Amino acid sequence: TATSISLGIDDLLTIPSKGWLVQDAEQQSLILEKHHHYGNVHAVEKLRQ
């Protein structure tokens, strides 16, 4: 009670590198999807990735 721990919107601290990692994953996913359309990889390879 005295310390009164309490969570706010900004208390939900996110990893600083989430933006980089998500952006890197999107680039790999987009590049792979583009070549899946080209026919350089098959559907299962896209699905696993």
Binding site: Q27, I31, L32, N40
Partner: protein, 43 residues
């Protein structure tokens, strides 16, 4: 004692993490033609 860098770092005063005088220039890398697909920049 030293001055500038290695003194701000010792005392914790604001300084770059990497010493500019010791920052090696990054060498030339693959130019999207020595590299496979899936690692090239999307153009």
């Amino acid at each position: 004692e030293e001055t500038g860098f290695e003194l701000d770092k010792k005392l914790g005063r604001p300084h770059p993490f990497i010493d500019p005088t010791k920052k090696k220039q990054i060498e030339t890398t693959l130019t999207s033609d020595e590299s496979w697909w899936n690692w090239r920049k999307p153009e």
